[PDB]
Write a protein that holds these residues in place. Sequence first.
Motif, PDB file in Angstrom:
ATOM      1  N   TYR C  66       0.827  -1.196   0.000  1.00 52.05           N
ATOM      2  CA  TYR C  66       0.000   0.000   0.000  1.00 52.05           C
ATOM      3  C   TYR C  66       0.867   1.253   0.000  1.00 52.05           C
ATOM      4  O   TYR C  66       2.003   1.251   0.479  1.00 52.05           O
ATOM      5  N   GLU C  69       0.856   3.157   3.968  1.00 51.01           N
ATOM      6  CA  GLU C  69       0.859   2.399   5.211  1.00 51.01           C
ATOM      7  C   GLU C  69       1.951   1.343   5.188  1.00 51.01           C
ATOM      8  O   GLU C  69       2.402   0.909   4.125  1.00 51.01           O
ATOM      9  N   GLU C 109     -11.931   1.945  -3.509  1.00 48.41           N
ATOM     10  CA  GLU C 109     -10.724   1.884  -2.692  1.00 48.41           C
ATOM     11  C   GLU C 109     -10.835   2.805  -1.483  1.00 48.41           C
ATOM     12  O   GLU C 109     -10.533   2.404  -0.352  1.00 48.41           O
ATOM     13  N   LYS C 110     -11.302   4.038  -1.701  1.00 48.24           N
ATOM     14  CA  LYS C 110     -11.355   5.018  -0.620  1.00 48.24           C
ATOM     15  C   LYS C 110     -12.290   4.566   0.498  1.00 48.24           C
ATOM     16  O   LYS C 110     -11.911   4.546   1.678  1.00 48.24           O
ATOM     17  N   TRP C 113     -11.140   1.477   2.365  1.00 50.32           N
ATOM     18  CA  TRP C 113     -10.136   1.879   3.343  1.00 50.32           C
ATOM     19  C   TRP C 113     -10.787   2.483   4.580  1.00 50.32           C
ATOM     20  O   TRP C 113     -10.384   2.183   5.710  1.00 50.32           O
ATOM     21  N   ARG C 114     -11.796   3.337   4.389  1.00 50.34           N
ATOM     22  CA  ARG C 114     -12.486   3.919   5.541  1.00 50.34           C
ATOM     23  C   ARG C 114     -13.222   2.857   6.355  1.00 50.34           C
ATOM     24  O   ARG C 114     -13.226   2.902   7.593  1.00 50.34           O
ATOM     25  N   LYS C 116     -12.394  -0.316   6.633  1.00 42.83           N
ATOM     26  CA  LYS C 116     -11.379  -1.055   7.376  1.00 42.83           C
ATOM     27  C   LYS C 116     -10.858  -0.242   8.553  1.00 42.83           C
ATOM     28  O   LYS C 116     -10.593  -0.793   9.628  1.00 42.83           O
ATOM     29  N   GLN C 117     -10.691   1.070   8.367  1.00 39.93           N
ATOM     30  CA  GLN C 117     -10.223   1.908   9.464  1.00 39.93           C
ATOM     31  C   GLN C 117     -11.220   1.911  10.613  1.00 39.93           C
ATOM     32  O   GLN C 117     -10.831   1.808  11.780  1.00 39.93           O
TER      33      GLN C 117
ATOM     34  N   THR E  37      -2.926   8.984  -3.822  1.00 41.19           N
ATOM     35  CA  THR E  37      -2.710   7.618  -4.272  1.00 41.19           C
ATOM     36  C   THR E  37      -2.696   7.595  -5.795  1.00 41.19           C
ATOM     37  O   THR E  37      -3.070   8.569  -6.453  1.00 41.19           O
ATOM     38  N   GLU E  97      -8.316  -7.098  -3.377  1.00 39.88           N
ATOM     39  CA  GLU E  97      -8.151  -7.558  -2.007  1.00 39.88           C
ATOM     40  C   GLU E  97      -8.587  -9.010  -1.866  1.00 39.88           C
ATOM     41  O   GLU E  97      -9.386  -9.524  -2.653  1.00 39.88           O
TER      42      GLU E  97
END
Lengths: 40, 40, 390, 452, 131
Positions: C66, C69, C109-110, C113-114, C116-117, E37, E97
């Motif tokens: 990534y 991270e 993706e964004k 990611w949020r 998962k956060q 990104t 993923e």
Amino acid sequence: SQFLLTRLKMSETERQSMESERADRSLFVQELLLSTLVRE
Amino acid sequence: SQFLLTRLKMSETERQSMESERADRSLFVQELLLSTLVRE
Amino acid sequence: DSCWELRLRCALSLFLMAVNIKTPVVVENITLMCLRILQKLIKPPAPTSKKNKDVPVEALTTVKPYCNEIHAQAQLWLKRDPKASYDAWKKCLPIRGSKSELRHLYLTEKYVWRWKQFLSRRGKRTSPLDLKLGHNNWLRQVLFTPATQAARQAACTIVEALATIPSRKQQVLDLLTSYLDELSIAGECAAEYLALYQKLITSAHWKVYLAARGVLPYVGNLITKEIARLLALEEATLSTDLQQGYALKSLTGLLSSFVEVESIKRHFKSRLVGTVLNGYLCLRKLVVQRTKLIDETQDMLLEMLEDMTTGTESETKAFMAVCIETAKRYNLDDYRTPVFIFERLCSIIMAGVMAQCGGLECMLNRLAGIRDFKQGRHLLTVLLKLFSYC
Amino acid sequence: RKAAQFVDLLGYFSLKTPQTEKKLKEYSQKAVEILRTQNHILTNHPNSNIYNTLSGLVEFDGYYLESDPCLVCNNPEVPFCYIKLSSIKVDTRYTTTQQVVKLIGSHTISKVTVKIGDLKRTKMVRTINLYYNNRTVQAIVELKNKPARWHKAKKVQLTPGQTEVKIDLPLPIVASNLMIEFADFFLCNACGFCKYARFDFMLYAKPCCAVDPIENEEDRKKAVSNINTLLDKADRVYHQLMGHRPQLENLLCKVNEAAPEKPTSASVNRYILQLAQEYCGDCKNSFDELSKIIQKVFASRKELLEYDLQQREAATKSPTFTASQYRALSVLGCGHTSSTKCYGCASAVTEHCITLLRALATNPALRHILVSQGLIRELFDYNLRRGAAAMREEVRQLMCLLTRDNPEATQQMNDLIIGKVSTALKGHWANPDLASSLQYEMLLLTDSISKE
Amino acid sequence: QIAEFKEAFSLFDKDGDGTITTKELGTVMRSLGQNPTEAELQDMINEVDTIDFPEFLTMMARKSEEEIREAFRVFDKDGNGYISAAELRHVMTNLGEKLTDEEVDEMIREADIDGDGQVNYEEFVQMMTAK
Ligand SMILES: [Zn+2]
């Protein structure tokens, strides 16, 4: 050269697999080393 | 020989006392060594 | 073999336990071996398979790290944590693979990611580290160690390999730039580190990015501080050092490298003329503590001064203003640097601009300060020549 | 190593003067602090490993792996010697009543003994005049010019029939070319043969590092060019010297393994021979050349700076200074300071610290204060195994003296010895060097016991 | 604030014409303290596109519920307003993923407050606004 014990090969697909595994091991060691330089 | 710090006597009665004390220290060490050789 | 992880853990534990000891015997007998082990692991032998005869190492990985991270965590890994193992780390990375497709990928993706956060924030998922490198570490210790050169070379290779994807390269370059002040303390022992740094900024956009972050004033301040230290040492004692002027030479070369390309040369010329001019004058003042490296530094500084002094009228006026500014601080007893300043001004002759800036009173006081003729003929000649010019 | 007499006097005066307890505490603190700083410098020195390994294998005088050459260690006290004038001769020219000689280089001449053989009653010399100069020329006839380019040295009158004469110089002269004149009463103009007598010359001299003086501007330019050339040569030699270190460390690594090799001066391990040849053979030569060039550069710099100061004073004459300020400003106080990162100088300072502490420990109160500072552990951990054999025995003696009548200090020392011996003996079985590296602890125990 | 953006744009301006190349576009706001990104970069190239100052300022000014609604629409391929575990699995597979069925099910379950085992638009809006 007459000793028998001193004389005690790899295919191509397993060579590709070994090279790939070397690549991921290198990447893991890179990230592991980067993890120790983070700010505290 | 000109250095002052390199040059930085005993009477007879204290010599007698020192020899006697050496004698008793020798005897004490003898008995101490004999104590470690006893039966067990 | 299949037990490689345990051996790597042993090597890394030994490395981090003995990386901060300054004794040369430890550096030569423990740290160097661990550095060589790490260097061999980071940089594997070139592939020999027929398909992969051309592609490099980065084109062989089956997962993609990534951007911002770090998922591997050494603190838990060194304690034998099952949730921070090699397979666990590899399972957390994604496999290597119109306008609407680009948009959909972006938001997926964004918001993934949020999601998962949030899951890590409330639930039990492990939180990845942030890619912000500290400025004090073992890396500066190893990079400039005077015990042995092989340790420095191995560390340079490791840090060069650590910078492949630009996300990591940005942080690596920032840390190396922060390490710039070690040049004077560790003069020749830095020869390796410099060779790494110049290699990492060999492209134009990295130089421009570093310039945008404010590196030119940093290098200028370092150069002026080194020149001041040289002058102070020259004034007092008469010792001889075979490494004198190495750090100043390297810093001046780095500044020239930053300046050679067009954009920063055009942009940052108005802020660097005073530093270079003052440094050139102070170096010219040297008479006894002078070596070949100082001569080359003076030559390069003169060339830089010549290169920057070519442009429009506004920049010429600003250069004149800063020239008078540096003429102000010099006392009235020295008769060498003002001569140079004024012959430069007359060569660039401009004649009325110092009337606007108020430099006329400076030269009036310069005339008023002359009390002797035998030792002040050159200053009087150049001042009269420029007065007739004006 | 120049401060032997100073520390001698300091120890003596501190021992003889009765003082308050606060002054004693301050003095002991200063001594222990200097000792600790020098020990820390020694244990972290970049060349410490190489020197420590080399000490037990080869016999070497100095440390030839130093980045900054040390003026103190590069300048030993050279004594005068009796040199025959012909041995240092280079070129000569004779005239009717004078003799002009040039030498290989500069020399610090002190006395001249002149011998006369095969003399004849027809004519002898009544007055000898000596002249000298330190300007280097390539042709003798060029320097033959009499008035301008010579300096008076000594005029000696001889009783008739003299065979040997002792021309003493009250101040030693630094000379490169010499001249002898027969003032009061002979020599062939072409070959210099003399029929009346035969003259032989002796000098009480020693080699000197000096350069031509500067009198005007082109001399200054020549000096600057020469100094640039010398700096370039010194830089090349310095790089050649520092290039030896990787090979030395490779040989040290190979020697440390101590692998048996199969094949009496040739039967010693080949790696030890290579180490001795590399260090005492090549590094020594490079170090000597570097020191010579550095001395020449220093002399040239001193001459140039003196000329600049004189010219500035002459220009300014067309501020009173006290006696100490004159020495501070002038070139007198220029060449007596050691380099900061010097191994030999730190070793010498540690030697002086050990000597001073041994002197100080003879006072019971100072002994108690020193043991309260924590000196025993510092001496045990650092100075037991480092230095010459004499230094090691002196450290053992000081450690024994510090515990002369103190049960607590004796218990502390015994605890250190017993702990080290037990720790080594635990792993003696898997490593015999642990058992064979206890000689200094056991020697300390023997010395402590042998003193009743 | 405009001064810093103008300075960065000019410093990255190569030919002095007031226009830069899009290959160095990421570096311009990488130097300003922001970290983009690669997908963000291709999206920004797509939105506008050589870029001049006005477009750069427009891009910087946008560095909204419409975005959340579009993300919800992308998540719900069928357009039924409910995010099933199958849709999330397809989205994750498309993104590259790798995940387990149990992990995805737990993620979906922890995203539901109503206990229906499904994600609603209001639920996603509340999850996004959580601080
Ligand atoms: Zn020294």
